[PDB]
Design a protein around this ligand. Structure first.
Ligand SMILES: CCc1c(C(=O)Nc2cc(S(=O)(=O)N(CC)CC)ccc2O)[nH]c(C)c1C(C)=O
Length: 127
């Protein structure tokens, strides 16, 4: 009935690097999605206690959210861009798994996803 702790966002035992793709994912992709009118439900972990959603964490075992992704990028949590992209994909997929299709939240998720997919199509060249 308690919320789980939020996903880890900096790990001292993990190596760190900056890459152009990672920089692009923070400066361009995340920034663009964050501003979106439908972003707000995804800007932080789902507070199942405040929302009175008792089975959210019974069902969703890999929670992810853009506030967490943002923190990860800012603390150099990801070595590879694909790690960041997978986190976004997990976020959207969770929403589809938990919610009935045609729920307001699911529709907001599709809109964000469509944008996200467009943005990662423009991802810059790897070193
Ligand atoms: C529908 C639940 C949900 C949210 C979400 O955020 N809903 C939400 C947040 C606020 S809120 O942030 O205003 N509120 C809570 C702390 C107090 C300020 C207010 C109303 C809401 O419906 N995000 C996701 C991904 C889901 C699911 C279940 O998929």
């Amino acid at each position: 009935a308690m919320n789980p702790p939020p996903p880890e966002t900096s790990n001292p035992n993990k190596p760190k690097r900056q890459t152009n793709q990672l920089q692009y994912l923070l400066r361009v992709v995340l920034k663009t999605l964050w501003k979106h009118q439908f972003a707000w439900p995804f800007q932080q972990p789902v507070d199942a206690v405040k929302l009175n959603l008792p089975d959210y964490y019974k069902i969703i075992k890999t929670p992810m959210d853009m506030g967490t992704i943002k923190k990860r990028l800012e603390n150099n949590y990801y070595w590879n861009a694909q790690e960041c992209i997978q986190d976004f994909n997990t976020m959207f997929t969770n929403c589809y798994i938990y919610n009935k299709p045609g729920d307001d939240i699911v529709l907001m998720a599709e809109a964000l996803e469509k944008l996200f997919l467009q943005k990662i199509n423009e991802l810059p060249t790897e070193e």
